Design a protein around this ligand. Structure first.
Ligand SMILES: Nc1nc2c(ncn2[C@@H]2O[C@H](COP(=O)(O)OP(=O)(O)OP(=O)(O)O)[C@@H](O)[C@H]2O)c(=O)[nH]1
Ligand SMILES: Nc1nc2c(ncn2[C@@H]2O[C@H](COP(=O)(O)OP(=O)(O)O)[C@@H](O)[C@H]2O)c(=O)[nH]1
Lengths: 426, 427, 170, 50
């Protein structure tokens, strides 16, 4: 029916998506060789959203891997569920950006994104009625930020009346891998404010604290973080793949959650998330799900909403549940903590239910809250960017490649008006 | 992706003898050149099962080259690669740059061209030289001049040996270092300093070797290079390339001088009684008791740092460890840079070579940082170079070769100008 | 604003009848696509490959093929009161030009009379349809009126409200 | 002998110097003109559809 193509950029995007296709294929019962082995008819009836039957029970994922280094692509086909992707979908450069956003947006982008667009165009016309596009990338890298950024801009010029998601991890001062993170973040977000339909703000700090306290893991490699992110992404699209009492497509959530067109950066959470010592001691009820859902520490972004107010919030529930519990729980969590919600919008929480849980659990949830606390992140990177730019450090790879001085001044100005308009609407 | 490594001078090709030794012992190749795909960055395959390194040894004196022609690796190196002159520059920068250099560097160039042509995705070059001599200084700078005009956009990793402050073997080396830096400044993209007294102190204290020769020095240098190319050779949880250091570590096109260090340099006995984890090696990479250049970053301020991690290392603790470093106050970063780190983790541990004095360690860290303590060393060189230049000692040899008094004064004021440049960025 | 329009119609009706006969070249009541090219040649403008077919297509809506004087008044009135109709105006312009012509090369200051009748508008709005200035006159022809009117209608048509909307500030 | 060797190298160096490709730059220029023509052609057609 409605179809979503998948686009993974850079190293972070590629590895996030690899675990994503593994988890999804397990939900629909496709083995790593790409054949159907499920039992229920509910699994076979909605695999056209993410796959195409090739020949004789061969279901291939509708995904496009794109980056600038061969190591990532080889690491995809090596691991399991690596043999399911069509090899033509490996659009692929060779030289590399080197964490230089200009090289990802002006130097190397000019020779790859045309090739990327051919594969993307083929995957859009391969399906009938597009629901939207799904892009997983970072904001601190070069080949994920710049390459994915220019791709997003060109795509919105081609298919403008279609939805678009960008799952993006953002950098933070405590988890600081690259040195030019602020230059990449502020310019990348400057493009996201005018191109993306809605963006989902992620960051690595929150992922580390989820695996520290909630999951109580000892050695949380990147496989577990990608495992966490994949559960959230599968949750946002369960409504398209399984029937339920209250369905909510991507368009339904965006039109309902975004009160003003430029304010489309979200904070995400997921429930339930429990450690192996406490997976036995818990119950599975809607209120138990709700408090662990709205918890401050359980946000999958390191921006505490309790420093500000909620504008809108959304809940996507999965499993056999009673809709009265759904509605009364949203009403109670809004009445006790009444100051944390915006005032000139009553009933700031939209909720929906789907009748198919993730495999291995009786009942789960997914939270999408559009709060006003996100301006902290924009200031936290803006001051670092201004601190660097007022002495032109690290600028010659930017100005020597094609940027001028006015682009950084444009970035600050757009940065400053967005944090100012967040401040007004709060 | 490929990178070729060129070696100039007595110290240069001796360093190569340890590097290619380490390489074949890591990729399981016998010294004759046959296995009993990741080797593609350094070795090209004949197609008959023989692997040949991407390297050219060249110098002006045939002594150090011809023991290599008859060691164990007689059959590993292609004969044309091992270039050799007929007579030495003899610790005379001008003699290596104008008299004898002008005949030998053109042969090296039309050789290095077909090494690059055999390559496909050339990442860059990386050069090895000691500035105290005449070959590594003179034709080294001449070779870098002609390399910049040929390629330009390709990285040129200069792993240079600067003369030690107090421990020195030659007497005209202050002249050679100043004139060489004058061109190493505007040609090398990323130039790493490797002193000799610092490596001497590491082998004395850490390796507890009280009688070290040049063999152990070259051994640990190869270890740092191996730790730096593992990200290019092998896959890790978080990798970087050689084009990453060009952007992430040098804020201005003339400030490219990095302090290197490595950890843990530990003997065979401490490892048995001691514990290895990520936090303590993240600490040990920063203390000045493990640096490779006699300077103190405690006197300077950091611009940006880089961290190679090898072995069984997860990414959660490298972040936690670098966080603990920033919250400490013994070392401080420049005001303009809020974030000053570039981290990287790779899966393969460092292999060991039999006969070396490096233990088999479970994990290791290779740190490459940039600071302003490097400004103190350059100033320290200027005092004793200017000390003798005014009275015109030893000038008659260089000017007799065909130079004049002009290039001393103009090279002197250029590096003097660099002193002022370092002081103004630190403020 | 009605008085300007009613008075204008009272006088232009007689001009219109002769304008019609003059456009016809066969001495009949029907205006063929053939005649339109002849008229443009008189104006001194050239049609494109398919312009005439569109011109004949859009105007006629009670029968198919050639046009008739009855269709012509229907067109005239609908287009004249069309203002917020977003309706076609391909063949209205050529006839209004011919009627507003009495010099047999075009008209100069009479654009303002055309403009005021449509709306009082503004001197700046006049600087939109063409570049005429109050003191200076110009030479004009068929070429420079039809093209500018056609382009203006395309320019207004494009603008619509998607994310171009602007709400009062908080 | 050495003068002749040097002279040949200069002649080789002069041959190698990149030279402007007239037969190809004009192609690029003509391609951009047709591209821009189609953009304006496209906007009129979109107007017609509305
Ligand atoms: N670190 C290190 N330095 C060395 C080694 N061998 C020589 N050197 C240094 O090289 C410097 C002199 O240059 P050499 O490489 O020996 O000689 P050269 O550079 O070829 O110059 P010429 O003697 O004129 O040929 C000395 O100051 C030493 O410090 C070595 O094995 N390890
Ligand atoms: N969740 C997750 N994040 C990653 C992974 N690898 C890298 N990152 C993040 O990516 C950022 C660096 O971006 P990078 O991987 O260089 O992006 P790219 O070069 O554009 O592909 C860091 O802040 C990391 O937190 C991974 O396997 N999982």
């Amino acid at each position: 029916m409605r179809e979503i193509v998948h686009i993974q950029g850079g190293q972070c995007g590629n590895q996030i998506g690899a675990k994503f296709w593994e988890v999804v294929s397990d939900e629909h019962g496709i083995d790593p060789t790409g054949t159907y082995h499920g039992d229920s008819d509910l699994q076979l009836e909605r695999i056209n959203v993410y796959f195409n039957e090739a020949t004789g029970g061969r279901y291939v994922p509708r995904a496009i891997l794109m980056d600038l280094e061969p190591g990532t692509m080889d690491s995809v086909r090596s691991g399991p569920y690596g043999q399911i992707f069509r090899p033509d979908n490996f659009v692929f450069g060779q030289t590399g950006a080197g964490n230089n956003w200009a090289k990802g947006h002006y130097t190397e982008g000019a020779e790859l994104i045309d090739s990327v667009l051919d594969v993307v165009r083929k995957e859009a016309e391969s399906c009938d009625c597009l629901q939207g596009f799904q892009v997983c990338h970072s904001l601190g890298g070069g080949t994920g930020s710049g390459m994915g950024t220019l791709l997003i801009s060109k795509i919105r010029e081609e298919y403008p009346d279609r939805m678009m998601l960008t799952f993006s991890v953002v950098p933070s001062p405590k988890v600081s891998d690259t040195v030019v993170e602020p230059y990449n973040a502020t310019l990348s977000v400057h493009q996201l404010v005018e191109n993306a339909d809605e963006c989902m703000v992620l960051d690595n700090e929150a992922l580390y604290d989820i695996c520290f306290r909630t999951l109580k893991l000892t050695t949380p490699t990147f496989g577990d973080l990608n495992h966490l992110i994949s559960a959230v992404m599968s949750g946002i699209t369960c409504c398209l793949r399984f029937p339920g009492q209250l369905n909510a497509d991507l368009r339904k959530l965006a039109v309902n959650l975004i009160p003003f067109p430029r304010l489309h950066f979200f904070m995400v959470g997921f429930t339930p998330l429990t450690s192996r010592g406490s997976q036995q001691y818990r119950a599975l009820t809607v209120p138990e799900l709700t408090q662990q859902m709205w918890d401050a520490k359980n946000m999958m972004c390191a921006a505490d909403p309790r420093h500000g107010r909620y504008l809108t919030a959304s809940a996507l529930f999965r499993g056999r549940m009673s809709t009265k519990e759904v509605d009364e729980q949203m009403l109670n969590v809004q009445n006790k903590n009444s100051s944390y919600f915006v005032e000139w919008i009553p009933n700031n929480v939209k909720s929906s239910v789907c009748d198919i849980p993730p495999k291995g659990l009786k009942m789960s949830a997914t939270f999408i809250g559009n709060s006003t606390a996100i301006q902290e992140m924009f200031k936290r990177v803006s001051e670092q960017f201004t601190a660097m730019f007022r002495r032109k450090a690290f600028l010659h790879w930017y100005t020597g490649e094609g940027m001028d001085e006015m682009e950084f001044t444009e970035a600050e100005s757009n940065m400053n008006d967005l944090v100012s308009e967040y401040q007004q609407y709060q | 992706r490929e990178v070729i490594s060129i070696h100039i001078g007595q110290a240069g090709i001796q360093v190569g003898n340890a590097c290619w030794e380490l390489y074949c012992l890591e990729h399981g190749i016998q010294p004759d050149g046959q296995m009993p795909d990741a080797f593609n960055t350094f070795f090209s395959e004949t197609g008959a099962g023989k692997h040949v390194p991407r390297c050219i040894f060249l110098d002006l004196e045939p002594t150090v080259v011809d023991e290599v022609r008859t060691g164990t690796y007689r059959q590993l190196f292609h004969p044309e690669q091992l270039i050799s002159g007929k007579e030495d520059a003899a610790n005379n920068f001008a003699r290596g740059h104008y008299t004898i250099g002008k005949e030998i560097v053109d042969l090296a160039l039309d050789r290095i061209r077909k090494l690059a042509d055999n390559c496909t995705g050339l990442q860059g070059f990386l050069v090895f030289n000691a500035v105290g001599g005449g070959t590594g200084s003179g034709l080294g700078s001449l070779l870098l001049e002609r390399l910049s005009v040929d390629y330009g956009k390709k990285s040129k990793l200069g792993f240079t040996v600067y003369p030690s402050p107090q421990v020195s073997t030659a007497v005209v080396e202050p002249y050679n270092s100043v004139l060489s830096t004058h061109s190493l400044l505007e040609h090398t993209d990323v130039a790493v300093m490797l002193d000799n007294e610092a490596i001497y102190d590491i082998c004395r204290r850490s390796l507890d070797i009280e009688r070290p020769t040049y063999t152990n020095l070259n051994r640990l240098i190869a270890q740092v290079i191996s730790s730096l190319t593992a990200s290019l050779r092998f896959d890790g949880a978080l990798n970087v390339d050689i084009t990453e250091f060009q952007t992430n570590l040098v804020p201005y096109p003339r400030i490219h001088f990095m302090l290197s260090s490595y950890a843990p340099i530990i003997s065979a006995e401490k490892a048995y009684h001691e514990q290895l984890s990520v936090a303590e090696i993240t600490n040990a990479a920063f203390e000045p008791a493990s640096m490779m250049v006699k300077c103190d970053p405690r006197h300077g301020k950091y611009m940006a740092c880089c961290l190679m991690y090898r072995g069984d290392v997860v990414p959660k603790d490298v972040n936690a460890s670098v966080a603990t470093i920033k919250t400490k106050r013994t070392i401080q970063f420049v005001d303009w840079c809020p974030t000053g780190f570039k981290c990287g983790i790779n899966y393969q541990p460092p292999t060991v070579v039999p006969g070396g004095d490096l233990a088999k360690v479970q994990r290791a860290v290779c740190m490459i940082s940039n600071s302003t303590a490097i400004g103190e060393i350059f100033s320290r060189l200027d005092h004793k170079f200017d000390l003798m230049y005014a009275k015109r000692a030893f000038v008659h040899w260089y000017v007799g070769e065909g130079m004049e008094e002009g290039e001393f004064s103009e090279a002197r004021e250029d590096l003097a100008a660099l002193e002022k440049d370092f002081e103004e960025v630190g403020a | 604003a009605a008085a300007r329009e009613r008075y204008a119609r009272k006088n232009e009706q007689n001009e219109l009848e002769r304008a019609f006969n003059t456009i016809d070249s066969k001495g009949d009541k029907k205006i063929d696509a053939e005649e339109l090219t002849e008229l443009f040649l008189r104006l001194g403008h050239k049609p494109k490959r398919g312009e005439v077919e569109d011109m004949i297509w859009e105007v006629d809506e009670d029968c198919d093929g050639c046009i008739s004087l009855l269709e012509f008044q229907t067109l005239y009135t609908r287009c004249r009161d069309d203002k917020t109709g977003y309706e076609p105006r391909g063949l209205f312009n050529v006839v209004e030009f011919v009627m507003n012509d009495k010099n047999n090369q075009g008209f100069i200051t009479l654009e303002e009379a055309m403009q005021i009748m449509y709306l009082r508008y503004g001197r700046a709005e006049l600087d939109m349809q063409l570049e005429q200035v109050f003191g200076t006159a110009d030479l004009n022809s068929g070429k420079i009126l039809t093209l500018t009117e056609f382009l203006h209608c395309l320019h207004t048509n494009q603008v619509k409200q998607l994310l171009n909307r602007v709400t009062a500030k908080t | 002998n050495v003068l002749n060797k040097q002279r040949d190298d200069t002649t080789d160096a002069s041959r190698l110097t990149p030279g402007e490709l007239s037969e190809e730059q004009a192609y690029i220029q003509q391609l951009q003109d047709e591209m821009k023509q189609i953009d304006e052609e496209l906007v009129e057609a979109e107007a017609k559809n509305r």
